[PDB]
Design a protein around this ligand. Structure first.
Ligand SMILES: *[C@@H]1O[C@H](CO)[C@@H](O[C@@H]2O[C@H](CO)[C@@H](O[C@@H]3O[C@H](CO)[C@@H](O)[C@H](O)[C@@H]3O)[C@H](O)[C@H]2NC(C)=O)[C@H](O)[C@H]1NC(C)=O
Lengths: 53, 221
């Protein structure tokens, strides 16, 4: 019957999970991966300069 | 060692196609990109292309994209280049070269050079000994000679005493005379050695399967 205003927070279709001390696998709206896990499996030149024996 | 053995000098009718080869040896074929360089006779070096053996990826220059084609025979440890529909333009020398690392690399081991000649001309020398004048002698040292005239195409190899004499020798560059090449050689020995010493001129022209010897006989007078 009356005008109203609501306070609320964001949500989305994210499936990204994150861990904490008290809880594991917490789905979260946004997360940043900070661990690199891939390499090119090759020995390469370093900044335009290796001696391969 | 890091040797790169490449194809032998070639002649192509204008409009035809060549396929010079470069055989790798002494290192692991599959670790380095092989490239081709063209040098317009005594002028400037041009980059043609590169190919990495292990998977056969190619990298071309704008200029040669069309006319050129790098290929690689992994079992053969061999890199090939193919030039299609040639002109006078392509008459120059082609070097098969190993570049060290990638896009930002230096060419460390350069091959000999396959030299291509593009002319409609037929394969064609004649060797003439050069004994000094009957009444004139250059003092302490006698200059002797050998004349190669009227042959095509380049090149020819001139040796003195099957190669054992390598000292006073000058072999001059060939020149074009009535659309044929002509060159001369000059062996210089001490006046006492000649005519006592056997001075023979050994000339070879692969393109015609010709090998000739001429002995310098003093002036019959
Ligand atoms: C967050 O949830 C993920 C997904 O369930 C958890 O990873 C999963 O952990 C289970 C074990 O509970 C893994 O099962 C295992 O699979 C191997 C495959 O060889 C097999 O030997 C058994 O079935 C074994 O139980 C499952 O593979 C794994 N899934 C993925 C994608 O890694 C993870 O444990 C959870 N994180 C926390 C903090 O609980």
């Amino acid at each position: 019957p009356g005008d109203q205003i609501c306070i609320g927070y964001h949500a989305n279709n994210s499936t990204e999970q994150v861990d904490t001390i008290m809880e594991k696998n917490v789905t979260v709206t946004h997360a940043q991966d900070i661990l690199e896990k891939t390499h090119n499996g090759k020995l390469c030149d370093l900044n335009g300069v290796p001696l391969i024996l | 060692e890091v040797h790169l053995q490449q194809s032998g000098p070639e002649l192509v009718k204008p409009g035809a196609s060549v396929k010079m080869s470069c055989k790798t040896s002494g290192y692991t074929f599959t670790e380095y990109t092989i490239h081709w360089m063209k040098q317009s006779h005594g002028k400037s070096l041009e980059w043609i292309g590169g190919i990495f053996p292990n998977n056969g990826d190619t990298t071309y220059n704008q200029k040669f994209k069309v006319r050129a084609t790098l290929t690689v025979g992994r079992s053969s440890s061999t890199a090939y280049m193919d030039l299609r529909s040639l002109t006078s333009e392509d008459s120059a020398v082609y070097y098969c070269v190993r570049n060290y690392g990638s896009s930002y690399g230096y060419f460390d081991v350069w091959g000999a050079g396959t030299t291509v000649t593009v002319s409609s001309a037929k394969t064609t020398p004649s060797v003439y000994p050069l004994a000094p004048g009957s009444a004139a002698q250059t003092n302490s040292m006698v200059t002797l000679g050998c004349l190669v005239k009227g042959y095509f195409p380049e090149p020819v190899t001139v040796t003195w005493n099957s190669g054992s004499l390598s000292s006073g020798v000058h072999t001059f560059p060939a020149v074009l005379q009535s659309d044929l090449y002509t060159l001369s050689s000059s062996v210089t020995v001490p006046s006492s050695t000649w005519p006592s010493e056997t001075v023979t001129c050994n000339v070879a022209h692969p393109a015609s399967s010709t090998k000739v010897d001429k002995k310098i006989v003093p002036r019959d007078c």
